[PDB]
Write a protein that binds this DNA or RNA. Structure first.
Ligand SMILES: [Mg+2]
Ligand SMILES: [Mg+2]
Ligand SMILES: [Mg+2]
Ligand SMILES: [Zn+2]
Ligand SMILES: [Zn+2]
Ligand SMILES: [Zn+2]
Lengths: 299, 41, 111, 130, 56, 286, 97, 111, 243
RNA sequence: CGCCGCCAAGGUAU
RNA sequence: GUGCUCGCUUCGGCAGCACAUAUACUAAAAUUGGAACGAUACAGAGAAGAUUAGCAUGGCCCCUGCGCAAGGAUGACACGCAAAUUCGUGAAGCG
RNA sequence: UCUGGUUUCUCUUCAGAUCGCAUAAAUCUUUCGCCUUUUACUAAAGAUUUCCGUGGAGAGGAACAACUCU
């Protein structure tokens, strides 16, 4: 079955799958976070309320107990997936929070980035920023490596930057995009980082102790960005074999991480697609878009 | 949806209808409060 | 512009409300126009307090015409604030201020 | 929830006893209305775009399931190659030169933003009507 | 973010309106009667700020 | 007495823009029929168009399936009098003020608080439609309803604004052709127009044209459907169906019943979802 | 209790609303599908999201509309069946008593 | 609505008493087709009160016992209210509470 | 709360404080006289039955009419309200009872019996099955959906009051002085006692207009039309067996 | 040892 | 439109950045229905004799008044319906 | 060597401090004194509000914010 979900009154910007594959989370312009049953009749239960801005990004921690929510109101909320109660508000940035990521494995960490040009490292126990990295241009997407040593940031300078938590220095720069980077995501191994950019190029970059030093490992094509200027996000399949990235042309693009062939182009959406997620065990794709509906593609 | 004259349809801020005694005195424990009513013979 | 436009809306056209805030009939009123045109405390007491502030602002603009000095205005609006009832008729539709008139009339001796 | 439950169509001849208007879904006697939380800036931007040049994108969710086209006046979209009202255009054509006097010293000669421009048988019928 | 203006605005408005014997401003005169309720809220704040005789 | 959330708003008053901004009030203006305090809403349809705020309330629009501000029907885009003349049931409503007007208006508002989805009496008889009123059902209507009303001082030549006067100019109106039931002056001429259409000129003889050339059969029209649609008119003498031209030939004994078929099938007989082709037969043994 | 509490709160903010209440924060849009006429009406009108704000009511206004109407009371709730005991009639003499 | 002031005391107690005896005889009379000729038991109650005021014993023949003894206890309740108000306002005009001509000229006949 | 409520035919409902013995609220708004009143056991609302056609809800701390219950055609004699649904029971002088909805204001169910009008309803308060009161064939009802449980015997006097005890005994007070006991298990008339007059009253003046038990329910006390409260206790005997 | 300071509806009908 | 930046090669040409869609649209109206009051002429004034204090009930009548005071001619409008007693007709049923 | 902020303008609830080094009116329930009925009243207590202002607290800016407390 395909499964069509509806509920969100405004554009949906993000959706994720619980780490154990039992439930979904979705949120967008409305300001509401909806939880869904992956199986059963695809029922909707709790609605998380309390964000005054729009929800830019949801994430689960590796345990599936904590749900993080970056909002345009400058606050990143921490949510309890079990009860639906709010835990903390990370008040800090002077402008919109564009994105957030939560470190897996190592003691709890959270990274945020915003239009004020800064990137901040948060310890959920401190109620204060730990480190601040002033760039100079607006920051759009941020992710941690699996060793919890490095922060990877994509902005509007077409250059992905890597930060060293101990030195607090610009360790690496990556060249290879012709335009703004809208979405970054690490492989489950830590081995590779997937990027979307306005230039319509999906580029995989490999981050390793020993690097070729020219890490344009692969390039894929087909993903279109347009005048809507929506943030575009991409995801790795549970086993790293598939690459999905949403586009503004109503099609879900799924590529073969090796041969680079388009495996899937799927329609069904009326508007631009904002995020595509893969179920952690089974070949199920959750597609979220600006038409306020979700689909559960099965492969 | 179209109530009486008291709700919205009048600006008659009438006398004797004012927020007087806007707090309710509750019967405390030294009087015949219902917590001591639920167990006495 | 509001106390005359109340009369202009209520279709009277015989009460000559003047700038120094008083009220006068003109036409030796019959029964169908006497009972239509008489006001209670809300119109009249507002008329007397507006007459009081009218006399105050007339005193200030008389000062700023340039023919009277500051001590004379001081004794003037002292007499205005101390001898209401003698010249404003504000006690007529609200008697509680009468004691306050006495509260003025006593303290003036202290002065 | 399951997509197959809402995707399953209704077995029937569409019931053409009703008309096209009354058999259509609604909740108010005029259309299905529901509130939402669309951004203000791009909304007003494409509103001003359609107000000036007459083309904009088409907002819905479940009309055709694939929609990325432009509406209104069609040819003026590809004539201007899809520009906005907040963007500096590729050319400056048909521009209209005014005169300025912003010294604020002269009398009856100061004409800044309040300036007038450089450019500055029916009565018989209107008499016969009245 | 609203602030002061020239003080010759109120004078021009009321010299245009005047004693309200014209047909042009008839949409506003009822609003003047709507200013009847809050007049002692203006007269009280007037008489609270009277100029002292050491002022001008 | 009345609160609302969103009005009826047929498409010819929304404007040419899907993106309009609208301001609202809680208790706005009175209706021009019954003086009920509705909620007037104000918006800008177009750049050369007036605001067209609100004419009537929600309840009086829910009686007769009427739009909000120009007093036309939502289901077609026609006035009320044409609609209940075409359906021949008026659903009466009084004329005075306190005699029987607000009484039955308040009661019909009271019994309609549950649905709010369909009118009170037109729900059963808006189904048997699209026969006599589909002939004049204007798609993509003229936007001259949305243009502002005429201003003065251009009639007398006094307009100091010139071009920046927002209403209109150089429009001389005519004092010869301009409420709820009756009477409407151009609507009588519109009924005369639909009564004076353009059929074929009737040849002057005594009803000898009993044959008729109807075609456009294809795969929708069959012989038994056509002879049962003729069976309600009367009995046959000799009928046939030819498939090299996709046509049918029917006659009648004493012409008159087929005559109203000539009234029924002048590009008007719509069965099986097709505008059929009809021209005259021979009736001359040619 | 919360039903009658929100009812009486709307009543107090309606009967006595005079003391310093904010209007609303009208940042919401409304999206209503033109599912009545549109095939070529305003070509491309498919769900037509519009903007809804509220006009500010100035606090210098008397009540505009004459609340003085009086109508007779209409038809009430329809009568239930009456279902008494079987009605008896006594005699010709106790009715005379 | 309007409250009951000192003038509508006797014009409200009689209305409540006639309403009470109205819905009492409406619920006490048996299943006959006629109730009270629409005002007659009220007339017997009023005439029993007028006969008690002159102390006429009011022995009317041919009358059922429950309506006549409910009229007797109702005029006895009105008599109790009448004498308990008579004692009260006699004490008030004795000590000097009210100076009303209506109360004094009424209490003359009510003693 | 440490205060009481009173009401009468002066078109006034007074809130008598008990810490100062004075009136603090002075409810008003009824277009006619007032017959009865009742309180909710849990929340701070009050219900009042009046003479014109209506029962009304008075909100404590606001003294504003939240709902007016307008469905009758005559006066309403008594009113009771409780915490469990349905809330409001109004028996009126147009020979009907009706059970209301306190939230929406519209009625839930109307109850048509009793050729002579209903004047007394009461809650038990332990379990369901409330009772009604009328001069002709006094009846018994139910809280959910309405249900005629049982009718009682020939208590054919015109009645005013009903009071019921938790252990199963019930008392009915009428207008002819005859007050009657009942049981809750069967519907059996036990005593059939009549009260004599204290010396000032005449032969037929006695009519029970109030009756209530103690909170221990060991003592009953009635207020009659002879301006007298009579107080009954138990009888510690054994030879009063049922035939 | 030094009270007290007064308006109107009640009448020339609707 | 305006300011800044040689930013791109003439102070001038160009490019970028910032500012980002008000208005019951009117001075009018062919104008719209025109209720109160005043003027004209009628009718005229509660309680089974006359002059009359009044307080009330109703709702499709209002006015003055801040009114849960009060007063407006008791503020005005409040009328013939007999019901069961006699007889005739018709219906339902019983011996 | 690092630490790095007084005013002004907008919401945000708590107030128990002569909230204000002073002090207005109204309502109810009672006692009075003028009084014919009432509103205008007299002046004492009991208990509520209304109203002119005030106290400390969460944010967003701007005003020399870079003088410099630390
Ligand atoms: Mg009167
Ligand atoms: Mg009268
Ligand atoms: Mg009187
Ligand atoms: Zn209407
Ligand atoms: Zn319309
Ligand atoms: Zn013009």
């Amino acid at each position: 079955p395909i499964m069509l979900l509806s509920g969100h009154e405004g554009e949906v910007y993000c959706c994720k799958f619980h780490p154990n594959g039992s439930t979904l989370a979705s949120a967008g312009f409305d300001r509401l976070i909806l939880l869904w049953n992956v199986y059963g009749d695809c029922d909707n239960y709790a609605t998380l309320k309390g964000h005054s801005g729009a929800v830019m990004e949801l994430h689960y921690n590796t345990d599936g107990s904590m749900l993080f929510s970056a909002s345009t109101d400058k606050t990143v909320a921490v949510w309890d997936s079990e009860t639906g109660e709010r835990v903390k508000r990370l008040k800090g940035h002077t402008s919109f929070v564009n994105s957030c990521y939560p470190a897996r494995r190592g003691p709890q960490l959270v990274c945020t980035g915003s239009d004020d040009g800064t990137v901040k490292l948060w310890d959920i126990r401190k109620k204060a920023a730990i480190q601040t990295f002033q760039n100079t241009y607006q920051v759009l997407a941020v992710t941690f490596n699996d060793t919890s040593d490095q922060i990877i940031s994509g902005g509007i300078d077409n250059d992905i930057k890597v930060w060293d938590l101990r030195q607090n220095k610009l360790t690496y720069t990556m060249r290879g995009h012709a335009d703004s980077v809208t979405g970054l995501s690490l492989s489950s191994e830590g081995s590779y980082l997937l990027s979307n950019a306005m230039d319509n190029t999906v580029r995989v970059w490999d981050v390793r102790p020993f690097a070729p030093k020219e890490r344009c490992v692969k390039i894929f094509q087909g993903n279109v960005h347009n005048f809507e200027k929506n943030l575009l996000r991409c995801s790795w399949s549970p086993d790293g074999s598939k690459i999905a990235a949403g586009s503004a042309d109503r099609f879900v693009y799924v590529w073969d991480t090796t041969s680079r062939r388009i495996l899937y182009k799927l329609p069904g959406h009326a508007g631009s697609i904002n995020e595509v997620a893969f179920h952690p065990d089974e070949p199920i794709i959750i597609s979220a878009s600006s038409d306020k509906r979700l689909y559960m593609g099965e492969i | 949806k179209g109530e009486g004259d008291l709700s919205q349809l009048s600006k008659q801020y009438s006398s004797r209808d004012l927020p007087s005694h806007t707090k309710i005195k509750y019967r405390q424990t030294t009087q015949d409060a219902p917590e001591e009513v639920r167990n006495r013979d | 512009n509001m106390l005359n436009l109340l009369i202009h809306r209520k279709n009277l056209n015989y009460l000559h409300l003047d700038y120094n805030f008083n009220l006068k009939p003109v036409k030796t009123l019959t029964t169908k126009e006497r009972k239509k045109s008489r006001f209670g405390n809300a119109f009249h007491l507002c008329r007397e307090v507006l007459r009081l502030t009218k006399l105050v602002v007339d005193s200030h603009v008389q000062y700023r015409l340039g023919n009277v000095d500051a001590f004379q205005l001081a004794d003037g609006l002292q007499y205005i604030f101390a001898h209401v009832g003698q010249l404003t008729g504000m006690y007529r539709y609200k008697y509680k201020l009468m004691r306050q008139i006495r509260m003025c009339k006593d303290l003036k001796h202290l002065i | 929830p399951t997509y197959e439950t809402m995707f399953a169509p209704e077995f029937g001849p569409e019931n053409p006893f009703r008309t096209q208007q009354m058999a259509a879904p609604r909740n108010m006697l005029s259309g299905y209305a529901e509130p939402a939380h669309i951004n203000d800036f791009m909304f007003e931007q494409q509103r001003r775009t359609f107000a000036t040049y007459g083309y904009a994108l088409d907002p819905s969710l479940d009309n055709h399931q694939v929609s990325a086209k432009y509406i209104g006046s069609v040819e003026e979209a590809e004539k201007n190659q899809g520009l906005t009202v907040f963007e500096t255009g590729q050319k400056k054509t048909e521009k209209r030169k005014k005169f300025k006097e912003n010294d604020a010293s002269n009398i009856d000669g100061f004409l800044g933003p309040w300036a007038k421009y450089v450019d500055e048988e029916e009565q018989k019928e209107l008499d016969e009507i009245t | 973010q609203k602030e002061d203006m020239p003080p010759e605005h109120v004078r021009k408005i009321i010299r245009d309106h005047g004693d309200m014997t014209n047909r042009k401003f008839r949409h506003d005169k009822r609003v003047y009667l709507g200013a009847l309720k809050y007049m002692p809220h203006a007269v009280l704040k007037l008489l609270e700020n009277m100029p002292m005789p050491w002022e001008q | 007495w009345e609160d609302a959330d969103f009005p009826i708003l047929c498409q010819t008053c929304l404007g040419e823009n899907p993106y309009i901004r609208m301001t609202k009030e809680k208790y706005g203006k009175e209706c021009k029929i019954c003086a009920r305090p509705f909620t007037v809403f104000r918006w800008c349809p177009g750049v050369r168009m007036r605001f067209k705020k609100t004419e009537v309330c929600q309840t009086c629009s829910k009686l007769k399936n009427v739009c909000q501000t120009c007093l036309l029907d939502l289901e077609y885009g026609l006035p009320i009098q044409v609609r209940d003349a075409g359906l021949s049931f008026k659903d009466d409503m009084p004329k005075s003020d306190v005699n029987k007007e607000y009484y039955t208006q308040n009661m019909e508002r009271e019994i309609s608080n549950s649905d709010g989805t369909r009118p009170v009496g037109m729900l059963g008889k808006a189904t048997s439609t699209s026969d006599m009123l589909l002939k004049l059902a204007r798609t993509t209507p003229y936007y001259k309803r949305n243009r502002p009303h005429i201003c003065s001082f251009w009639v007398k030549g006094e307009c100091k604004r010139g071009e920046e006067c927002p209403y209109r100019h150089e429009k001389p109106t005519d004092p010869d052709d301009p409420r709820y039931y009756g009477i409407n002056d151009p609507v009588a001429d519109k009924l005369l127009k639909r009564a004076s259409t353009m059929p074929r000129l009737d040849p002057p003889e005594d009803k000898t044209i009993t044959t008729l050339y109807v075609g456009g059969l294809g795969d929708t029209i069959t012989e038994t459907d056509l002879r049962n649609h003729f069976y309600q008119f009367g009995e046959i003498r000799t009928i046939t169906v030819v498939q090299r031209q996709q046509c049918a030939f029917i006659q009648f004994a004493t012409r008159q019943a087929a005559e109203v078929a000539a009234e029924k099938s002048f590009n008007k007989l719509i069965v099986n979802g097709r505008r059929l082709n009809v021209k005259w037969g021979r009736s001359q043994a040619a | 209790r919360v039903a009658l509490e929100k009812s009486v709160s709307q009543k107090v903010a309606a009967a006595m609303p005079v003391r310093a209440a904010d209007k609303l924060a009208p940042a919401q849009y409304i999206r209503y599908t033109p599912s009545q006429q549109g095939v070529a009406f305003n070509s491309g009108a498919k769900q037509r999201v519009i903007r809804m704000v509220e006009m500010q009511k100035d606090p210098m206004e008397p009540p505009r509309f004459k609340i003085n109407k009086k109508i007779p009371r209409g038809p009430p709730s329809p009568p239930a069946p009456v279902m008494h005991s079987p009605s008896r009639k006594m005699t010709v003499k106790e009715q005379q008593e | 609505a309007k409250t009951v002031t000192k003038q509508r005391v006797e014009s409200h107690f009689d209305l409540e008493l006639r309403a009470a005896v109205m819905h009492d005889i409406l619920d006490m009379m048996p299943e006959g087709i006629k109730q009270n000729k629409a005002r007659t038991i009220l007339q017997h109650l009023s005439e029993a009160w007028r006969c008690w005021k002159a102390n006429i014993p009011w022995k009317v023949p041919g009358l059922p016992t429950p309506i006549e003894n409910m009229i007797l206890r109702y005029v006895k309740a009105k008599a109790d209210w009448w004498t308990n108000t008579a004692h009260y306002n006699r004490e008030r005009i004795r000590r000097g509470a009210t100076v009303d001509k209506t109360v004094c000229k009424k209490n003359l006949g009510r003693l | 709360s440490p205060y009481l409520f009173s009401c009468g035919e002066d078109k006034q409902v007074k809130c008598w404080d008990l810490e100062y013995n004075k009136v603090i609220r002075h409810y008003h708004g009824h277009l006619s006289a007032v017959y009865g009143l009742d309180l909710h056991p849990t929340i701070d609302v009050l219900v009042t039955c009046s003479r014109d056609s209506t029962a009304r809800i008075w909100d404590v701390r606001t003294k504003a009419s939240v709902h007016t219950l307008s469905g009758h055609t005559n006066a309403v004699a008594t009113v009771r309200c409780q915490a469990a649904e349905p809330q409001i029971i109004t028996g009126s002088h147009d020979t009907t009872i009706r059970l209301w909805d306190l939230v929406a204001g519209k009625t839930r169910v109307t109850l048509t019996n009793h050729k002579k009008s209903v004047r007394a309803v009461v809650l038990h308060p332990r379990h369901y099955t409330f009772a009604s009161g009328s001069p002709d064939n006094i009846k018994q009802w139910k809280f959910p959906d309405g249900s005629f449980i049982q009718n009682l015997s020939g208590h054919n006097a015109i009645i005013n009051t009903l009071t019921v005890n938790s252990d199963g005994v019930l008392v009915s007070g009428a207008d002819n002085g005859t007050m009657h006991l009942w049981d809750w298990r069967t519907g059996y008339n036990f005593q059939r006692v009549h009260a004599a007059v204290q010396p000032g009253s005449l032969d037929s003046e006695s009519g029970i207009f109030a009756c209530a038990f103690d909170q221990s329910e060991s003592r009953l006390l009635t207020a009659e039309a002879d301006k007298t409260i009579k107080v009954y206790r138990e009888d510690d005997t054994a030879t009063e067996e049922t035939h």
